[PDB]
Amino acid sequence: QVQLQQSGAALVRPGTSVKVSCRASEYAFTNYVIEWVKQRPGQGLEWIGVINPGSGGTNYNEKFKGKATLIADKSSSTAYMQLSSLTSDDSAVYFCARSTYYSGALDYWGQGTSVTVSSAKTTAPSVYPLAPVCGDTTGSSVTLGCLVKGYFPEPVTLTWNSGSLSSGVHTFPAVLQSDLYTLSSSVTVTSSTWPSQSITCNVAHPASSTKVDKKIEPR
Amino acid sequence: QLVLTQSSSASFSLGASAKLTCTLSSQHSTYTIEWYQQQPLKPPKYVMELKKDGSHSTGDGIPDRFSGSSSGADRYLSISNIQPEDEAIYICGVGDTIKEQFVYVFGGGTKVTVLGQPKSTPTLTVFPPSSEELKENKATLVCLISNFSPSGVTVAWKANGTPITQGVDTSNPTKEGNKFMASSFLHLTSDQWRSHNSFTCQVTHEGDTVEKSLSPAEC
């Protein structure tokens, strides 16, 4: 398997530099080149440049000439792209990819590195218990919820009864409104289980060293 | 001047035949192009190299359903017996070396939709605002959308059966087992929640509509 492995997700502040890494394995590093591709979130692919590891030669899209610096280390078989003077324009998924000296095909692609240029501040979530309105309590099953509103950054961990409720749980990835994340989790139990037995969602926000347990009570 | 123009993001029946067009800038009529496939939230995949004569060489793990062909400045990607896994944005790329300066350019992409796929209809779970949140003069209505495939849904909220579009945050669909899940949040004041007869979460999927309403009223 030909593989390129890039450094992880990065959340940095405007005006800063970032350095994404692209480590090649299972192919001859200096028999091929590395090219870098930008992708803003809802947009098409944008080409940034290429480094020839064997020569150290660089070619760049003119738009990124003052923005991206490409370097490669032969001894580590690793390629790096430095982004400078980060604006919110620079917020994208950055790909690395293999190409040949003499053809256009980007034949193998890295996994990608989400670079986020944001000013948002660390915020513990408000956690709310979600009990059904009275119309939704007359079924053979009953579904309870947890709203985790206005947290930053990702992630939060959510469990039910400290993990003793595992099946019939659906935990939804967060939506982002105005630099705050919101998410919800549901757990479905037999109507004979709740409210007769206790159900609590356990929300931890490692970034804020906070944990909240919310007991679901009938409304 | 080096420009790739892609035909309009189009739909095909499962197991039908698709023909995408990537058209070169007049003066670059003779040029070899590459096709790329980008599936939901995956890195782009190299599909093929395609020459002026219509000869082509396909990438690692591209089924022989994919062929290429050319007519003047036009570069075609043909998919026979199209499959769900073929649902993707198809992007063309082209390289050239102008002043000893190499440049790669991408087309804008063609979003390819595969119709009549195996259909799993969405389950909706809708939660009213918590007592706790209402006491803060705020009200988040939660719509949880699960157990659907393929991934394409739209979400609409209704207030007394009329559109409400302000204060809605709707996630992208993401994988959950062999199906998809999505979430939608409608931010109201406690007065807006109390003053209305009903709110509706209305989800479209594959020509179907599912809706779940709740009321502030007593049972």
Partner: peptide, 6 residues
Amino acid sequence: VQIVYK
């Protein structure tokens, strides 16, 4: 003609 050199 198309030239690719990197």
